[PDB]
């Protein structure tokens, strides 16, 4: 139904150290909430994240939510624009209901630019910040944390103060973001001895970080394709091949 608690921890997320020191607060706001009520503080009630895809986005709120030990929900994104004129959201108006039950907890809302610009479809919208602004208890520390691609576009009304009053950017990892993730998903894999990671981390270049660790896997299930046991530099040079976005018309 309502539960899912996260085993990923910061680790998990290579680069991006500072990105994430923006979003320790919030991971000491759910552990500790006792020690600013009892000091009388106001913790936010919401964290931005935006950048490209594939980047951490997700990862780190579940890191957040990990290294806290608190639960994590989730909020379909592209959900909430494939429903009708009827039954639709009203899984904001549980999910918060779930939330502020188990709480301390947190509401991650990935590519909420998608129900942020009919009887729809700020009907899922203009709800959110219902359930957001109140309603009938400030004591449970509950935080929301969206995700966006295209910020540009982000509805106006989110970030007025009380919101997403705050935020956390981080884009594609650099050269070193890219050898970091290529090291962090390069463990538990069969390698070749002539693995340049280096090297591969600079024919990867303005790549996502999903699609590095894709690159990998893609590099290695080529490896056992032609049965060849090692996953050589050749394989990963042969991936970076799906590094085509492909034509969208
Ligand atoms: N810095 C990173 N370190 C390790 N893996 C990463 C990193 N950034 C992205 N990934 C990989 O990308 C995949 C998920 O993409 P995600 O970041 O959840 O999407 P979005 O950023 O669009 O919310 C994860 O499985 C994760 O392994």
Same mark, same amino acid.
């Given at each position: 139904?309502?539960?899912?608690?996260?085993?990923?921890?910061?680790?998990?997320?290579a680069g991006?150290?500072?990105?994430?020191?923006?979003?320790? *607060? &919030?991971?000491?706001?759910? $552990?500790?909430? =006792? !020690?600013?009520?009892? @000091?009388?503080?106001?913790?936010?009630?919401?964290?931005?994240?935006?950048?490209?895809?594939?980047?951490?986005?997700?990862?780190?709120?579940?890191?957040?939510?990990?290294?806290?030990?608190?639960?994590?929900?989730?909020?379909?994104?592209?959900?909430?624009?494939?429903?009708?004129?009827?039954?639709?959201?009203?899984?904001?108006?549980?999910?918060?209901?779930?939330?502020?039950?188990?709480?301390?907890?947190?509401?991650?809302?990935? *590519? &909420?630019?998608?129900?942020? $610009?009919?009887? =729809? !479809?700020?009907?899922? @919208?203009?709800?959110?910040?219902?359930?957001?602004?109140?309603?009938?208890?400030?004591?449970?520390?509950?935080?929301?944390?969206?995700?966006?691609?295209?910020?540009?576009?982000?509805?106006?009304?989110?970030?007025?103060?009380?919101?997403?009053?705050?935020?956390?950017?981080?884009?594609k990892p650099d050269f070193n973001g890219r050898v970091e993730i290529?090291?962090?998903?390069?463990?538990?894999?069969?390698?070749?001895?002539?693995?340049?990671?280096?090297?591969?981390?600079?024919?990867?270049?303005?790549?996502?970080?999903?699609?590095?660790?894709?690159?990998?896997?893609?590099?290695?299930?080529?490896?056992?394709?032609?049965?060849?046991?090692?996953?050589?530099?050749?394989?990963?040079?042969?991936?970076?091949?799906?590094?085509?976005?492909?034509?969208?018309?």
């Open positions: 139904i309502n539960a899912e608690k996260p085993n990923v921890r910061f680790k998990d997320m991006n150290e500072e990105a994430k020191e923006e979003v320790v *607060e &919030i991971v000491d706001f759910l $552990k500790y909430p =006792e !020690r600013y009520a009892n @000091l009388g503080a106001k913790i936010p009630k919401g964290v931005l994240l935006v950048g490209p895809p594939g980047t951490g986005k997700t990862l780190l709120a579940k890191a957040v939510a990990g290294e806290a030990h608190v639960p994590f929900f989730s909020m379909g994104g592209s959900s909430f624009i494939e429903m009708f004129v009827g039954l639709g959201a009203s899984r904001v108006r549980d999910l918060f209901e779930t939330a502020k039950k188990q709480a301390p907890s947190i509401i991650f809302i990935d *590519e &909420i630019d998608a129900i942020g $610009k009919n009887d =729809e !479809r700020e009907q899922t @919208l203009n709800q959110l910040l219902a359930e957001m602004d109140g309603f009938g208890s400030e004591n449970a520390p509950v935080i929301v944390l969206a995700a966006t691609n295209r910020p540009e576009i982000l509805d106006p009304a989110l970030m007025r103060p009380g919101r997403f009053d705050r935020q956390v950017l981080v884009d290529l090291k962090v998903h390069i463990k538990g894999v069969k390698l070749a001895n002539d693995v340049n990671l280096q090297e591969v981390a600079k024919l990867t270049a303005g790549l996502a970080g999903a699609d590095l660790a894709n690159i990998i896997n893609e590099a290695a299930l080529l490896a056992g394709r032609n049965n060849q046991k090692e996953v050589r530099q050749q394989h990963l040079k042969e991936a970076v091949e799906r590094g085509i976005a492909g034509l969208e018309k």
